[PDB]
Amino acid sequence: MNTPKEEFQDWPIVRIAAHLPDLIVYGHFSPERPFMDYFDGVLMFVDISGFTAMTEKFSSAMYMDRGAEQLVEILNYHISAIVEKVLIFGGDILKFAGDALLALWRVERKQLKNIITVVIKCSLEIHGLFETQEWEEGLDIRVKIGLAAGHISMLVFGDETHSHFLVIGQAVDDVRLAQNMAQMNDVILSPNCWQLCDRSMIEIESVPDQRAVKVNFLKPPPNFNFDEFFTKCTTFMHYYPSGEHKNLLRLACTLKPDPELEMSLQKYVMESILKQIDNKQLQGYLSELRPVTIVFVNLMFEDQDKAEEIGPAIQDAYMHITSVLKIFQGQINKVFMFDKGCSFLCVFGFPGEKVPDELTHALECAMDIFDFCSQVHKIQTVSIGVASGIVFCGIVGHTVRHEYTVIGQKVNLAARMMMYYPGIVTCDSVTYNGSNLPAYFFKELPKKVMKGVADSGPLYQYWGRTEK
Ligand SMILES: [Cl-]
Numbered sequence: 001m002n003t004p005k006e007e008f009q010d011w012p013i014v015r016i017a018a019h020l021p022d023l024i025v026y027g028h029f030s031p032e033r034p035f036m037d038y039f040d041g042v043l044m045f046v047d048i049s050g051f052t053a054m055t056e057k058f059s060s061a062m063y064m065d066r067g068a069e070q071l072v073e074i075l076n077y078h079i080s081a082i083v084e085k086v087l088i089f090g091g092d093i094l095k096f097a098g099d100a101l102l103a104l105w106r107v108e109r110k111q112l113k114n115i116i117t118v119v120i121k122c123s124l125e126i127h128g129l130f131e132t133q134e135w136e137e138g139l140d141i142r143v144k145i146g147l148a149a150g151h152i153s154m155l156v157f158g159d160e161t162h163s164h165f166l167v168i169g170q171a172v173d174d175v176r177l178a179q180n181m182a183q184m185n186d187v188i189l190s191p192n193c194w195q196l197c198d199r200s201m202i203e204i205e206s207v208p209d210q211r212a213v214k215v216n217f218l219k220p221p222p223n224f225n226f227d228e229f230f231t232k233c234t235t236f237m238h239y240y241p242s243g244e245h246k247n248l249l250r251l252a253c254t255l256k257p258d259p260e261l262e263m264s265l266q267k268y269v270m271e272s273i274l275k276q277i278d279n280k281q282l283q284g285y286l287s288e289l290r291p292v293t294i295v296f297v298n299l300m301f302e303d304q305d306k307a308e309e310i311g312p313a314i315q316d317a318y319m320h321i322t323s324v325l326k327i328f329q330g331q332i333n334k335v336f337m338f339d340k341g342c343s344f345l346c347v348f349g350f351p352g353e354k355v356p357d358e359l360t361h362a363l364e365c366a367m368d369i370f371d372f373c374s375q376v377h378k379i380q381t382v383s384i385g386v387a388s389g390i391v392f393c394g395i396v397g398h399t400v401r402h403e404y405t406v407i408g409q410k411v412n413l414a415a416r417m418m419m420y421y422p423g424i425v426t427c428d429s430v431t432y433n434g435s436n437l438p439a440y441f442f443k444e445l446p447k448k449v450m451k452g453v454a455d456s457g458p459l460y461q462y463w464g465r466t467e468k
Pocket of ligand 1: 166
């Protein structure tokens with residue numbers, strides 16, 4: 001009998017799993033919300049703000065109304081190269097959030113030392129991709145890398161139709177702190193990463209006023225062979241593609257239909273992505289330069305990285321947020337930690353989600369969220385930034401690992417406003433002027449220089465309907 005080759009496997013379940021890390025795809029978690037798990041690992045934070053900063057040049061008339069298509073193409077070309085490096089070195093891309101790619105090597109505590117070596121090599125090879133790189137004006141197609149190691153907590157929250165996950169804890173805080181110290185082309189190690197690493201592998205430089213360190217070179221001992229070392233490390237990598245499947249970038253490329261698993265996984269993916277996955281919408285429909293309102297919600301906790309107390313509080317906040325956004329087809333695009341606060345990136349006006357009077361609705365939704373979350377047990381401070389304008393939306397990443405992402409000056413502005421004007425609902429001039437709500441519902445704010453934004457325009461506090 002003939003032996004014809006297996007079909008290229010591109011079942012819906014495989015297409016869904018492209019949008020999710022192995023942490024979720026193979027997690028088999030309890031249905032309970034919140035769900036908390038605890039493990040150890042090495043985190044890599046790749047700052048791709050240098051790539052995402054391209055949204056401005058692609059809004060130019062030079063791109064002839066194909067700005068979004070051109071942007072997604074060049075962003076994915078460069079980001080795919082980073083993704084392939086992380087996956088080949090055995091990492092799990094957790095999230096494309098906060099103009100960064102966050103990757104995880106989950107390993108038993110005893111193996112952290114050897115895995116840091118693998119992750120440092122990976123980090124240097126990432127930098128090596130962009131060594132002879134430019135874009136005919138600026139050479140700043142480069143990245144910054146922060147690494148951390150240690151205890152990691154995972155939170156899964158949501159309801160019966162939607163699920164979100166977050167990683168929590170000191171190593172999560174550390175990796176963001178480490179990447180923030182990095183200059184372009186740097187690999188910075190968190191204090192605990194430096195303490196846990198194989199110091200015989202690396203030459204470091206002190207970081208002024210910091211216990212974090214900078215990797216100058218990976219200079220291994222004489223009898224060292226990275227390939228044999230890597231092979232030894234794969235013993236501890238549960239999902240590294242191997243044997244029959246060593247030619248695939250992810251084990252998840254081999255996932256077979258399984259309705260109970262697909263029911264679980266689809267809850268992490270928004271419905272317009274699932275429409276595309278089901279071949280019920282054109283594959284290019286979600287790549288667009290679209291006017292939206294960003295409502296960026298930051299929740300601060302006293303117990304800044306203790307999953308047992310912050311997990312219920314986030315789930316409580318989520319249940320209210322989701323109820324508020326449902327009314328106006330608002331979506332939660334991303335949730336992630338920033339300086340130990342939990343941030344919800346909410347978007348009004350996604351494709352096919354429109355709704356007229358988007359601005360006044362966005363403000364009223366923000367105030368509703370503000371008032372409710374301020375009374376949630378263990379939430380110390382709520383801050384909300386509201387900014388409106390043209391943003392890039394689209395699926396960013398590699399074919400085998402990508403996520404729907406919103407990028408733009410107005411996303412960064414709403415994020416910076418919630419940090420620089422804590423404890424209040426703030427909005428930009430577009431939102432203030434467009435809302436047509438009476439002027440005394442707002443307070444014109446002092447101008448703050450916010451790192452990443454120049455120049456914000458007049459900013460306002462949404463005070464609300466009454467003097468209160
Ligand atoms: Cl996360």
